[PDB]
């Protein structure tokens, strides 16, 4: 819902939208932090990425 409209930053299913580590992004990312972590437990390359 309240996620910049484009898409829920919680969407950890369709990881077709790359974005790991980072540090800037935008506004709050605490809810996004858990997202990435939730995806990594399923199928999100936890390698390194740059």
């Amino acid at each position: 819902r309240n996620v910049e409209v484009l898409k829920r930053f919680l969407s950890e299913t369709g990881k077709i939208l790359p974005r790991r580590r980072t540090g800037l992004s935008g506004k709050e990312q605490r809810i996004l932090a858990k997202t990435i972590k939730r995806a990594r437990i399923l199928g999100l390359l936890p390698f390194t990425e740059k």
């Binding site: 829920r8 919680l10 299913t13 939730r38 995806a39 990594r40 399923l42």
Partner: protein, 97 residues
Amino acid sequence: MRRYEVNIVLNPNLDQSQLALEKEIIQRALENYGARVEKVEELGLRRLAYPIAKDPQGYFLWYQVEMPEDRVNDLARELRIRDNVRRVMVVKSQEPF
């Protein structure tokens, strides 16, 4: 009554028969814990962030039920006992994300 969400990953080498069996067992086991299947989706075969059982890929399943709060951890355990079940994930509120 707490609504949840489960993400199961079966063996990527199961036939339509064996695959159908697992689902019939998962949906069943859920009902045994007061879980009502509100919707099911079969994502398919993607790629794990880590090779489980020497398998870099697996078949993902999608479930959404509203089972008792004090019986969730009991289901996940009742599901991960299956040799086919590569892993299970549970969260909260409709679709998982």
